[PDB]
Nucleic acid binder design. Structure first.
Ligand SMILES: N[C@@H](Cc1ccccc1)C(=O)O
Ligand SMILES: [K+]
Ligand SMILES: [K+]
Ligand SMILES: [Mg+2]
Ligand SMILES: [Mg+2]
Ligand SMILES: [Mg+2]
Ligand SMILES: [Mg+2]
Ligand SMILES: [Mg+2]
Ligand SMILES: [Mg+2]
Ligand SMILES: [Mg+2]
Ligand SMILES: [Mg+2]
Lengths: 242, 835, 334, 49
RNA sequence: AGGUAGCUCAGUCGGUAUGAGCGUCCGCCUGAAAAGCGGAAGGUCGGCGGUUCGAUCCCGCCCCUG
């Protein structure tokens, strides 16, 4: 006979993916930093070396907050936690941050205006691109299994130089091909300068990946709408999450 | 798409082949090379293909078929060798003596469309005259394809004359590589990737300088507008009847530009080839001296599209004595626009301030081919080279005379060197950043390829980047050039050792525990949207001065009626609840852990703080204090059956006490004690609403929602809700040391009568205070009203468990403790022992 | 690399049982004296084959536990004798199950690494020591209060502890009737994951309860965690937003037909249109007939691509009733 | 009024201390290894010198 | 072109909303259900205004979908 008088609930799959990512980096000695969702333009753009009056900034999909001159916004990425962390902590710094981010994209099967990112930041003496790759590979192997591989190709972000995009490869995918995963790079010396750090003594790398995107291609979720609409039928199959 | 760059492969190979003869590459290999060096290839579009008889034709006669609604004509077309065909067409963008592309029967067009002979209208239609879209050549289907006169002779193969073996690359250029918005830049980038000698199509070896025997037109330049270079060169006596040749119209079409008159075609062609925007002014329409100045407060201007635009004091524009000539680097006016009436044009080569163009083109909402490139900086050293390339090509097409005069404003203190300042960098700095020991001389060689002058001095290189790379300003910029050309795939994977970390904070750990605890009790977590539902607080009937109405607002929301950011998590939870119920899932328990947004009078904008230094501590405190309060809340809602029906019984509907228990689930997960006190607070039911306290601090509310709110909001009847401020719950790390007596216990029950509105918790507190240490447990198990009690009264019966720490407690000692408990309840809440 | 999957699962099981009202104890490995005789176990019952300590602290308790239940029942009796009669306890710990292959190994030289066979031989000479999870219950499962008189512990509470552990392990289980001391032969389930038995649950045998001085109605659960395979599912649920159709079906079967078998038959015939099935009534009476029972299920149908019509739902329901007839002899209720 | 129909249980304090110790060392990059309670004298004594 | 009961839809050409199906409620049926019969509750006719003694109906503006 059925025996469950109190049906199990469920923590949210994106929250649980975030918990797995957090545990992956804490197990490597890193720590978890935090930042608010409504942010200053100073930290979302200016201290991240975004030019003013330039397409690299103006063509971001930004939610601006009233009044017109407020210079307040819903953060477009978790990268302002880089600024807050470098201002608040002593060096060396090895942190990730997981939180909500906001862009002006209509909700469809592959986009959502409200999503989550994991940001990574490491600033120390002697850090190189090879240290960035090693962290990305450990990150990939922990989220996608021992067959996971990463690859980087050049790209651009104002807050990194060099900049790159990260693809990931894992078996039992699709069955296997490169999927776009996120972005990374060496922390721009202008970012270190804006936080009072000497770029001649310290170098750093950073990265950022969207969690809904990760969950979509790792699990094969067809409709991103199901991740954000709160239907219990979407969450319950993932289990309690305790 | 403001970052897109479309060009055909053939044009790209031609520029590369000048310094590297016989260089040819498959489209798939080229795609991989462009990706390896940092260019996104959005799409690779092969033209065509056509199979069978696709031939250039010549329209002889156009016997228009009258009577029909749409204009339908029958055409006699020569397919070469004077073997005539009859075709029926609906287009009307061609006359007698035009060149067209015909598709005879048997041919197969892209894709899977075989042409056969059909009887259309009253005549026989052998083939069809094709459009650029039907040939998979262009994007226009409003009219058929009209080759310019003399492009080919009738009978020539269509695939050959149209170049349908070519391939078009669509690229997304990053905003730091504006020099790649041209054939010049991408050809140079390929030459670097393939280690080829490169012939710059803008060098005087490839564009011989035209004579400068005087000034070409009066010009005064306000130096504060940001203009870096302004050049002018006239062309006199152009043939208004002549059109651009096929190779030029085709290349324009494949790049996404449709041809018009040759004066405008060459400006768009040189912009695409060299990256320098070009504009043609009608020299006969210019009246007086040209002046580059700021706009006045209300000065308006019409563009060459006929729309007038309100300018701003920050907009840069060019104006003569009559009216404004153009919005600088955005769009030209209809005044000096070149037409089929025009014969003498004045070409302008200008370099505008990028920030100024970016501001104006966004405030006016017209991104153009010119504005996109000026936004991303244009090479100021090639202005005259592109001006002479443009004038020489225009006369070669419109049969004119290149006037040997030129104006070239290079600044109030004129400038003859456009290169950025030099950069000092250690030779092995790229090796250190890459974690790779590059072979000797790699950095110096790569940096020369991109166009920089490199000088050695022991271990230090002095790099002077070229004028088309204003993005190269620091050693890190040079490192990107070396690494991306060598390929990022050679960089090894070295897991860095991090210091011993401290793990999760107490607050991070508590957020997990709360989530595990609510989920295990049957709640389902939702990700709550911060955009409040329209009118929610009116549906709730909140007062006008309720703090929850003071919301932060978004200027550009996705739904115009939902601009407010949430001050409470409940409207998002109630929206997810309504969504489940309307889909047939009516027994629902939801929760959320998320921050809210609560602005104060101190919430305000903060102007730009200089980023060349760490902000001061007060600047940090300014920034932090200027943001709305963003505390972490936990909330939950419930509707329908709390417990389902099954073989055990009919289940139990949600009640307010289920909301009080969710409070206690959260308190236990937080390891704090809470008290619930009666309260009145919308949207809760005023008789079924608790305010939650930790110590004497309020941390939220719980209970059943108000029936009026439920009805107005379309919620299920009996919906309950909880919202607590997690930031107001202090973090606790208790170290218990329980007393565990093994001596036997004494069990006694006591029945106490009190006034009906005395909280049962207050009675139990009084019983406990008087009983003292011998009391181990007290539990209420009966609440009774009835005529044997009296009106306005209630009876509470508690089970008490007494125990001593050192002895077998006697019933008399227990009864004495019980008597003291009853006395304490008498004094504190007026309890009367039940008789 | 962090915690292993098994270490993470042990945490999750304990969190899940503690949140459901169970109190963890640390179980002693020294069995009570003569426990298996109190249980009435057969002489060849594998649980009697115990590893023995030469020098125990209590001379009559030298045997190491092959099962966690006697330690849990000892802690339950201690609580009850101190006046705490409403008790739910659990334990997660290894047991000691020696085989015929359990034996002693001579000293191996320590001036070098042992060989691979020496390592294997030392491990194989030790008794099997798998991780078990176990729980016991007595008294009121739900306390009395202002809401009502509470609810006494019943065997369904032990079955639910099985499902608490299964959800925490993210595996599916089936419960099949079984006869296995010290459980009550009519109130005892053997627990399966796939076709692998992983333990037992239910109410304890009344004669065991009497001989052992246990609370009447004591229930118990024991599962072998090492037999439950670890799972890392990657769900991708289908969430159709089209309206659902709600229908109940009432079916008569023989009184000893397990309700789960009727639900499986109903589900098998209804097909993909069936989103949910829930039993909410079990009835016997003169209308039904001797040795029969009536089961009523609430069914929820929904299409992935369209608004399902009533008739489409009724055709799926008819196919469900037909599959029940073929598979368990079910008869539509009249 | 009291509202807890399903009283909370408790993991054991020694287990919770163990979990805190474990989490302390995992956050430092260490890992958690395991071993049986019934052991050989070889590993309990002899290979430990 | 349309917006009419909780939803889906007929209908009303300035002064009686003339309505259906579903859903809900209430009886019958069942131990209790679903389904099935039987009956009832249910309508500022999209919002803000104008005109008129009077507007769901005419006029203006605006929201919503194809
Ligand atoms: N912030 C980038 C990702 C990124 C983070 C850190 C470094 C580089 C890239 C994004 O939103 O896509
Ligand atoms: K922006
Ligand atoms: K949440
Ligand atoms: Mg760069
Ligand atoms: Mg007594
Ligand atoms: Mg009483
Ligand atoms: Mg039962
Ligand atoms: Mg139905
Ligand atoms: Mg119905
Ligand atoms: Mg009946
Ligand atoms: Mg009536």
């Amino acid at each position: 006979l059925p025996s469950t008088r109190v049906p199990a609930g469920a923590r949210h799959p994106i929250i649980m993916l975030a918990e797995h990512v957090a545990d992956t980096f804490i197990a490597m000695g890193w720590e978890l930093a935090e930042g608010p969702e409504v942010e200053t333009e100073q930290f979302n753009f200016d201290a991240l070396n975004f030019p003013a009056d330039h397409p690299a900034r103006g063509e971001q999909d930004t939610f601006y907050i009233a009044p017109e001159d407020s210079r307040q916004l819903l953060r477009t990425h978790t990268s302002p936690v880089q600024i807050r962390t470098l201002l608040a902590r002593e060096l060396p710094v090895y942190i990730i941050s997981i939180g909500r981010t906001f862009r002006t994209d209509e909700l469809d099967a592959t986009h959502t205006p409200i999503f989550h990112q994991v940001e990574g930041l490491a600033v120390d003496r002697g850090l190189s691109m090879a240290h960035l790759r090693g962290t990305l590979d450990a990150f990939a192997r922990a989220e996608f299994g021992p067959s996971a591989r990463t690859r980087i190709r050049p790209h651009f972000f104002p807050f990194t130089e060099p900049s790159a995009e990260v693809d990931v490869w894992f078996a039992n995918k699709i069955g296997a091909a490169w999927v776009e995963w996120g972005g990374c790079g060496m922390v721009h010396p202008n970012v270190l300068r804006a936080t009072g750090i000497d770029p001649d003594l310290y170098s750093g790398f950073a990265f950022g990946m969207g969690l809904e995107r990760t969950l979509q291609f790792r699990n094969g979720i067809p409709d991103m709408r199901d991740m954000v609409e709160g239907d219990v039928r979407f969450s319950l199959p993932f289990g309690v999450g305790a | 798409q403001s970052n897109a760059m479309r060009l055909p492969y053939s044009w790209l190979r031609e520029v590369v082949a000048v310094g590297a003869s016989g260089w040819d590459v498959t489209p798939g290999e080229l795609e991989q090379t462009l990706l390896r060096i940092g260019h996104e290839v959005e799409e690779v579009i092969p033209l065509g293909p056509v199979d069978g008889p696709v031939t250039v034709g010549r329209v002889a006669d156009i016997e228009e078929l009258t009577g029909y609604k749409k204009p339908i004509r029958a055409c006699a077309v020569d397919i070469g060798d004077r073997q005539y065909r009859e075709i029926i067409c609906g287009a009307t963008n061609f006359a007698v003596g035009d060149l067209v592309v015909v598709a005879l029967p048997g041919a197969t067009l892209p894709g899977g469309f075989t042409i056969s002979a059909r009887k259309a209208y009253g005549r026989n239609s052998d083939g069809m005259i094709c459009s650029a879209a039907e040939l998979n050549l262009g994007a226009d289907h409003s009219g058929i394809l009209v080759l310019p006169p003399g492009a080919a002779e009738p009978g020539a193969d269509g695939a050959g004359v149209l170049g349908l073996d070519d391939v078009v690359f669509h690229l997304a250029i990053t905003p730091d590589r504006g020099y790649c918005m041209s054939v010049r830049g991408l050809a140079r980038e390929l030459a670097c990737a393939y280690d080829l000698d490169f012939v710059d199509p803008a060098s005087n070896s490839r564009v011989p300088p035209l004579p400068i025997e005087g000034p070409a037109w009066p010009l005064t330049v306000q130096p504060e507008t940001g203009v870096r270079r302004f050049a002018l060169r006239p062309v006199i006596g152009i043939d208004p009847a002549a059109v651009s040749p096929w190779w030029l119209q085709r290349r324009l079409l494949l790049c996404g530009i449709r041809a018009t008159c040759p004066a405008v075609d060459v400006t768009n062609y040189v912009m695409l080839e060299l990256g320098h925007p070009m504009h043609a002014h009608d020299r006969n329409r210019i009246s007086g001296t040209l002046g580059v100045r700021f706009a006045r407060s209300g000065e308006t201007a019409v563009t060459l599209d006929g729309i007038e635009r309100k300018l701003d004091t920050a907009d840069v524009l060019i104006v003569d004595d009559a009216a404004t000539a153009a919005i600088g680097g955005v769009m030209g006016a209809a005044s000096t626009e070149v037409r089929a009436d025009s014969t003498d044009v004045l070409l302008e080569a200008a370099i505008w301030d990028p920030a100024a163009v970016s501001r104006t083109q966004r405030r006016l909402h017209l991104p153009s081919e010119a504005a996109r490139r000026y936004e991303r900086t244009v090479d100021p050293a090639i202005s005259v080279a592109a001006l002479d390339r443009c004038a020489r090509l225009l006369a070669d097409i419109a049969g004119g005379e290149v006037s040997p005069t030129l104006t070239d404003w290079r600044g109030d203190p004129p400038c003859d060197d456009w290169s950025p300042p030099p950069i000092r960098m250690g030779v092995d700095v790229p090796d250190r950043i890459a974690g790779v020991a590059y072979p000797q001389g790699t950095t110096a060689r790569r940096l020369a390829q991109i166009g920089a002058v490199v000088t050695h001095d022991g271990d230090t290189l002095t790099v002077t980047p070229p004028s088309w790379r204003p993005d190269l300003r620091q050693p890190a910029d040079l490192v990107e050039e070396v690494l991306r050309l060598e390929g990022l795939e050679v960089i090894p994977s070295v897991l860095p050792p991090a210091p011993a970390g401290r793990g999760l904070t107490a607050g991070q750990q508590r957020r997990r525990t709360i989530g595990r605890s609510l989920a295990l009790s049957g709640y389902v977590e939702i990700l709550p949207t911060p955009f409040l539902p329209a009118g929610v607080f009116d549906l709730w009937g909140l007062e006008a001065d309720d703090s929850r109405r003071m919301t932060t607002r978004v200027l550009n929301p996705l739904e115009a009626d939902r601009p407010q950011l949430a001050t409470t998590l409940l409207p998002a939870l109630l929206e997810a609840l309504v969504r489940n119920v309307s889909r047939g899932l009516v027994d629902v328990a939801l929760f959320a852990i998320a921050q809210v947004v609560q602005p104060t009078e101190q919430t305000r904008g903060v102007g730009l703080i200089p980023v060349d230094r760490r902000p001061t501590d007060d600047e940090i405190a300014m920034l932090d204090a200027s943001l709305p309060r963003q505390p972490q809340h936990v909330a939950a809602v419930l509707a329908g059956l709390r417990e389902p029906r099954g073989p055990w019984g009919p289940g139990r509907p949600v009640e307010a006490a289920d909301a009080f228990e969710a409070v206690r689930i959260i308190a236990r997960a937080s390891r704090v004690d809470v008290t619930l006190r009666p309260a009145q607070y919308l949207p809760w039911h005023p008789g079924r609403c608790a305010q939650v306290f930790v110590g004497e601090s309020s941390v939220g509310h719980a209970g059943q929602l108000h029936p009026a709110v439920i009805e107005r909001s379309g919620l299920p009847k009996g919906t309950c809700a909880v919202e607590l401020n997690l930031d107001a719950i202090p973090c606790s790390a208790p170290l218990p040391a329980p007393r565990v007596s093994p001596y036997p216990a004494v069990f006694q029950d006591v029945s106490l009568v009190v006034a009906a509105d005395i909280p049962a918790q207050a009675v139990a507190d009084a019983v406990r205070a008087g009983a003292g240490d011998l009391l181990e447990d007290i539990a209420l198990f009966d609440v009774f009203t009835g005529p044997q009690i009296g009106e306005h009264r209630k009876s509470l019966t508690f089970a008490l468990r007494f125990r001593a720490p050192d002895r077998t407690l006697t019933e008399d000692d227990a009864s004495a403790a019980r008597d003291a408990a009853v006395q304490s309840a008498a004094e504190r809440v007026g309890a009367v022992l039940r008789g």
